[PDB]
């Protein structure tokens, strides 16, 4: 399966502080300038190497010069527009890498927001954009005015402009504070100054006004930004729906739209084999030869081989077959309920396919929404799932799958996952381990394993709330292959005479559990090592 | 010179260097004349030259299906004292793509006068060469004034390819259906949509004028939908409002052809916005039903491929099998 999207682009303005305070050092943490550079580089790398149509502008504030269209003398000073709205390229990446330098001045970030708004308003008149976004990378360590505030908000609601904020610190509450410092890992309210607190209050007020309580979820830190897909959250697009009718019998039909919820992301481009010197594909010929079953080197024509099928110990030639004969004439695209069954009967290990579908009611259909809600709630109440037949179109091979209810506070739907046929099941037999005298663990070994499992827990219960918190959610972590590939490609494009750089530290940090688990597990691991003999075979 | 009428059917054919390889044999056949004003010789015995002229006509005529020559040659001698029209050259073909011709091959050509004259109320033809003319035209053998004019006459029946059809509109007037566009104002397209996961309609039918406006006539349930009189500005609008089961298709993508082609007029120039023809009288509905039936009959043998593209990422492609018929309408 592949993702098909609408075809709408977005305009994104990156507002970056380059002021004096965004250069301070500390023995163990990078300066906020470098972290903002890393986040911006990651965003632009993904935009460039995926060949998207989104247009990106870059506005620096805190610079030593002034190149903004609102200067007018003694106003909006030290704000430069380093790049206007256009498709990103390698020149922008080189500029981010080794052309943009820290400044020696300070600028109000609300004036920078005004300049970014002006860029969005006056540079999108001739073009079409479905989303307008501003990402602000600041540290909130400069004096600011509050006069224009209200006007700002009004504009942000008149022109429909979204905002995201990135800061050197997080927005956690009662975090409790806590070897070497690691960036990008999963694991400081007293470390900020009063001006930072005032800036944080104003940022919170703007975010609450624009969106609400959920707006507080759109304030991130650079460290957590490097290990999430948050910078792409407001410019992502969903797939084109699959329209059909859920049929229970031949008299009940519900108009439904299906969307792809899970689908593996793959590299879009491959590597082309080219000549060493000319660096062109035309200097390479790939010809296949069917050299019989020996080295006779007999000339073979393309029509000499007639092809055929195998049915065990016999061969049915292609000359005795017809295209119309072996063709399963499908009845068409369908979504039909074969039956309802207990949820315990359908197990997870039998899930098949390479996609998960979410089924909603058809857009602008109140009756369909009511009917689908009734079906979902009945299934949830009775603890049952619908075994259904699924056909993508009149050419796709029909499959049998399971649809189960999915109720949330903001939406409700069905979830479709494929199920196996008889031919896909392998009936192996394995020896029982619990009933084995040869491999029966002792009590001490069981105690050691219990201690190991206790010390390596990745969850924590909330304080008298019965809520489980995940200390290592891997589902929010991006695939490291894409960032590593982008880094290597950019390094090759900008440093042709250099070897590929090593893997960045923050990728390793985000691929590893918190250091607390590793610290806790050291002693039970030693006990397990001293209790379980493990000798390699000497064949 | 291929003389073509308004119906595309050849009427007059003049040859100069085409029968020079046959005249000697034809004269050798001619000597068996003994005091006959207009002699007739059956060619059931000497049918070789019949085959030779058949081969020549097959080679030098366009869009030929069958040539049925008659096995009789009529030799006529013309003297300085003669004047003939027969004044009764009226004859209506029974079918559409078939025609009977008279073939005159000159044996002894007059040196000065007495050519053959062919009449038609848009121009007149006078010729003194090997001629082949339909039986629907009045002809004159002009009064020769010197020598003698000895000619040979064959009878020819030719059936061409079926590029012409007739449909009855009312008692008085009928309508002509043509496979190709030439001075035709209206085009009917019978469309079968290839299987796509977004398309919920199999077959449709539209009428398009040169302005590009489209009127839906049939949706595989008959011609009932033409009663609603749904008119769209183009074919993309017809697809947007007809073949998609969801609510707002225009919000998801836009349909266009990447080669600037039209479903009916190909790479032509659409006119400015004009009124679109719609059926008002029961005769119009009967004609529309007949046209839809005929188009459905031929939809499995003749059709072409049309492609529409939706600006998705990746782009979506819709494939249509189109059967087109071009026609005119009375004022």
């Amino acid at each position: 399966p592949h993702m098909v999207r609408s075809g709408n682009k977005a305009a994104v303005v990156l507002c970056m502080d380059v002021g004096f305070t965004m250069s301070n050092s500390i023995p163990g943490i990078e300066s906020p300038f470098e972290q903002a550079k890393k986040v911006i580089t990651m965003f632009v790398q993904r935009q460039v190497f995926a060949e998207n149509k989104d247009e990106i502008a870059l506005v620096l504030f805190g610079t030593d010069g002034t190149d903004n269209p609102l200067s007018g003398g003694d106003q909006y000073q030290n704000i430069t527009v380093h790049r206007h709205l256009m498709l990103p390229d390698f020149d922008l990446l080189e500029d981010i890498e080794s052309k943009i330098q820290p400044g020696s001045q300070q600028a109000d970030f609300l004036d920078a927001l005004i300049v970014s708004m002006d860029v969005i308003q006056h540079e999108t008149i001739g073009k079409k954009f479905e989303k307008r976004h501003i990402e602000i990378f600041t540290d909130l360590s400069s004096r600011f005015s509050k006069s224009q505030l209200d006007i700002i908000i009004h504009s942000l609601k008149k022109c429909d402009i979204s905002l995201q904020f990135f800061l050197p610190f997080s927005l956690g509450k009662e975090d409790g504070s806590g070897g070497p410092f690691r960036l990008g890992g999963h694991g400081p309210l007293k470390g900020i100054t009063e001006q930072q607190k005032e800036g944080l209050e104003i940022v919170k007020m703007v975010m609450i006004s624009l969106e609400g309580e959920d707006g507080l979820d759109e304030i991130y830190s650079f460290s957590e930004s490097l290990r999430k897909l948050c910078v792409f959250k407001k410019i992502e697009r969903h797939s084109i729906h699959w329209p059909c009718r859920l049929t229970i019998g031949s008299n009940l039909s519900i108009r439904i739209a299906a969307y792809k919820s899970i689908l593996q992301e793959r590299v879009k481009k491959t590597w082309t084999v080219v000549d060493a010197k000319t660096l062109k594909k035309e200097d390479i010929q790939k010809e296949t030869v069917y050299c019989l079953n020996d080295d006779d080197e007999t000339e073979v024509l393309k029509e000499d081989i007639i092809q055929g099928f195998r049915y065990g110990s016999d061969i049915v030639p292609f000359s005795k077959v017809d295209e119309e004969q072996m063709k399963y004439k499908s009845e068409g695209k369908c979504f039909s309920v074969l039956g309802f069954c207990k949820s315990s009967q359908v197990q997870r290990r039998f899930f098949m396919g390479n996609q998960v579908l979410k089924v909603f009611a058809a857009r602008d259909d109140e009756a369909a929404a009511v009917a689908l809600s009734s079906l979902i709630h009945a299934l949830d109440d009775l603890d049952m799932v619908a075994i259904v037949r699924y056909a993508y179109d009149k050419r796709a091979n029909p499959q049998v799958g399971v649809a189960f209810p999915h109720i949330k506070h903001n939406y409700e739907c069905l979830v479709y996952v494929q199920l196996p046929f008889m031919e896909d099941l392998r009936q192996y037999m394995f020896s029982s381990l619990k009933n084995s005298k040869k491999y029966a663990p002792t009590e001490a070994q069981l105690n050691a394993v219990d201690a190991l499992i206790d010390s390596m827990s990745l969850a924590k219960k909330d304080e008298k709330t019965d809520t489980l918190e995940d200390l290592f959610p891997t589902t929010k972590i991006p695939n490291p292959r894409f960032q590593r590939l982008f880094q290597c490609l950019l390094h090759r494009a900008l440093h042709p005479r250099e070897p590929l750089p090593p893997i960045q530290q923050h990728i390793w940090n985000m691929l590893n559990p918190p250091a607390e688990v590793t610290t806790k597990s050291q002693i039970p691991l030693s006990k397990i090592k001293t209790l379980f003999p493990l000798i390699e075979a000497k064949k | 010179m291929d003389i073509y009428d308004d119906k595309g059917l050849q009427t007059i054919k003049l040859f100069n260097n085409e029968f020079d390889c046959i005249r000697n044999d034809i004269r050798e056949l001619f000597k068996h004349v003994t005091d006959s004003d207009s002699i007739q010789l059956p060619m059931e015995d000497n049918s070789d030259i019949i085959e030779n002229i058949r081969k020549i006509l097959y080679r030098r005529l366009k869009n030929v299906e069958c040539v049925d020559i008659d096995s009789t040659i009529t030799f006529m001698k013309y003297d300085p004292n003669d004047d003939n029209k027969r004044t009764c050259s009226n004859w209506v073909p029974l079918t559409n793509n078939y025609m009977e011709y008279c073939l005159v091959i000159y044996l002894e050509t007059p040196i000065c006068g007495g050519k053959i004259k062919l009449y038609h109320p848009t121009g007149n033809i006078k010729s003194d060469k090997d001629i082949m003319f339909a039986k629907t035209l009045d002809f004159k053998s002009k009064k020769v004034l010197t020598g003698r004019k000895t000619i040979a006459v064959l009878d020819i029946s030719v059936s061409y390819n079926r590029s012409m059809t007739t449909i009855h509109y009312n008692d008085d007037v009928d309508i002509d259906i043509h496979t190709d566009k030439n001075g035709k104002e209206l085009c009917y397209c019978y469309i079968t949509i290839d299987d796509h996961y977004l398309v919920d309609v199999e077959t449709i039918g539209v009428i398009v004028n040169r302005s590009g406006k489209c009127l839906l006539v049939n949706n595989h349930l008959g011609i009932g939908i033409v009663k609603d009189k749904r008119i769209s500005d183009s074919f993309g609008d017809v697809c947007m409002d007809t073949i998609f089961d969801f609510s707002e298709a225009r919000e998801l993508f836009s349909l266009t052809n990447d080669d600037n082609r039209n479903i009916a007029w190909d790479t032509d120039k659409l006119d400015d916005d004009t009124d679109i023809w719609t059926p008002v009288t029961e005769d119009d509905y009967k004609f529309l039903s007949r046209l839809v039936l005929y188009a459905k009959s031929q939809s499995d043998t003749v059709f072409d491929y049309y492609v529409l593209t939706g600006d998705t990422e990746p782009p979506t492609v819709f494939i249509f099998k189109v059967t087109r018929f071009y026609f005119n309408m009375p004022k």
Binding site: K286, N293, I306, I315, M429, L433 | -
Partner: protein, 502 residues
């Protein structure tokens, strides 16, 4: 090695034709249908195994060395259409009559002679020798109870056959009063460890359970890989990874030379256009075009940019099972079992981990790298306890379920939707409809229609017949049955839910 050898031994005594019910499958028909199903499964799976069918207890004989009451219907060869048809000749009441006419159905036999004939069948094959096994279909638990001399010879011959290397499995069928294995067998059948002492199958009564038992004891388990599970850099155990589910694809056509029909190799060569010649692997480079910019990498660098960790499974921690979502499915799961042949002591640690993970209801979150130079994926090892049905068939193997977890890039955005709730009356009507259409789901209840149609056409062609009769798909809902069951509830649900205008 590579070609497994399996011999189907079917008893031809009188009691195999007694059916205790007028509408029931006789044991002989059960055995014939099971063998036919095994042949069809082998052909569909494209498994190059050797199968033989031998009848003992008949009045006619066809064995090589002249022995009485032993008929070798089919010797060792690959499955085919003609053998399947010949087996089909014996199915049903007419098939029973045909078999009782071509052969006998009552005689005196010696198990020693039968096993000797089967051993000679094993010897006659010269292609490959690996995994020889004899499956006995019978419902007589005391074959030589009145002849101790024959019983001792049978025990001795079974012992020597077992020392040679041939496995002996029993497929005992239903008997009046129960089947007693301890009476005469347990001195012939192969027993390894304790899996054939207390975990032995029960007597078969139907076709489905007998088929499952036959396929369970004849299919050798093949491991995709033998990785290393590392609790840390020092404690490393050896495990095997299996695919208990795998999509069945329609076999692609093969290319055959015109001279007879022979498989032909498909070689690939690289030519440098006019110069020609086999281009050296170091004479080529890899390129990628972005806009108007060309990026050039060597093949080794292309492999290096994909390299994160060494192959194996690296433990990251332990997570409660409630934190794993059913709608986060990415790709089919795998199965993890201990492997004692590589690291000694792996089974004990594996068993302890399985017991404790089942007790505490935790899954092991690990990092997975299948091969060299492959980026990692986060996986969850979910503990899985052994489950047996009433027939003592292992429906669930003990071990770990390797569940693939999605990355952030594999999760797609959903469009905004307004939550529309349904009144309790509509939900109640829907509950009534749902209950009226309730059925039991089994993992082996549906067959792929395209595969079945393709192989039916192939079988019809290989037998030189015409196009086969189409069969009704079993994955298509029975609309009429559902409509009759639902009755009027659909109309009332539509009245409550669907507005009259639309």
């Amino acid at each position: 090695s590579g070609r497994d050898s399996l011999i189907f031994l079917v008893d031809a005594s009188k009691a195999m034709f007694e059916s205790q019910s007028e509408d029931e499958l006789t044991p002989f028909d059960m055995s014939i249908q099971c063998i036919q199903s095994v042949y069809i499964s082998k052909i569909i799976s494209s498994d190059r195994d050797l199968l033989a069918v031998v009848f003992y207890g008949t009045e006619k004989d066809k064995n090589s060395v002249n022995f009485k009451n032993i008929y070798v219907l089919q010797e060792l060869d690959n499955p085919g259409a003609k053998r399947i048809l010949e087996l089909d000749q014996f199915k049903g009441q007419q098939g029973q009559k045909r078999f009782q006419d071509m052969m006998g159905h009552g005689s005196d036999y010696s198990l020693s002679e039968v096993l000797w004939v089967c051993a000679n069948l094993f010897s006659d094959v010269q292609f490959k020798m690996s995994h020889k096994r004899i499956m006995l279909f019978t419902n007589e638990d005391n074959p030589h109870g009145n002849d101790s001399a024959k019983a001792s010879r049978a025990r001795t011959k079974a012992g020597d056959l077992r020392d040679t290397g041939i496995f002996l499995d029993l497929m005992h069928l239903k008997k009046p009063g129960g089947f007693d294995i301890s009476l005469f067998y347990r001195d012939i059948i192969s027993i390894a460890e304790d899996e054939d002492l207390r975990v032995h199958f029960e007597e078969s009564s139907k076709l489905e359970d007998l088929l499952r038992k036959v396929r369970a004891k004849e299919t050798r388990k093949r491991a995709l890989s033998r990785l290393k599970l590392k609790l840390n850099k020092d404690i490393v155990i050896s495990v095997g990874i299996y695919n208990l589910v795998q999509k069945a694809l329609k076999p692609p056509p093969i290319k055959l030379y015109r001279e007879t029909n022979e498989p032909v190799k498909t070689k690939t060569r690289t030519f440098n256009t006019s110069t020609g010649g086999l281009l050296l692997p170091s004479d080529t480079k890899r390129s990628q075009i972005y806009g108007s910019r060309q990026i050039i990498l060597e093949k080794e660098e292309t492999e290096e940019l994909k390299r994160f960790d060494d192959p194996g499974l690296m433990l990251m921690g332990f997570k409660p099972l409630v934190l794993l979502k059913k709608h986060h499915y990415l790709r089919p799961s795998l199965f993890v079992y201990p492997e004692e042949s590589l690291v000694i002591g792996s089974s004990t640690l594996f068993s302890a981990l399985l017991i404790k993970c089942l007790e505490k209801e935790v899954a092991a979150l690990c990092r997975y790298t299948p091969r060299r130079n492959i980026p990692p994926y986060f996986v969850a090892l979910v503990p899985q306890e052994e489950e047996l049905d009433d027939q003592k068939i292992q429906v669930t193997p003990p071990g770990f379920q390797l569940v693939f977890l999605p990355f952030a890039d594999d999760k797609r955005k959903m469009p905004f939707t307004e939550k529309i709730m349904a009144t309790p009356e509509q939900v109640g009507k829907m509950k009534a409809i749902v209950e009226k259409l309730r059925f039991t789901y089994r993992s082996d209840s549906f067959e792929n229609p395209v595969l079945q149609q393709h192989f039916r056409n192939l079988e019809a062609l290989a037998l030189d017949l015409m196009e086969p009769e189409q069969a009704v798909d079993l994955t298509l809902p029975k609309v009429e049955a559902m409509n009759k069951r639902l009755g009027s509830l659909v109309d009332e649900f539509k009245e409550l839910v669907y507005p009259p205008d639309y």
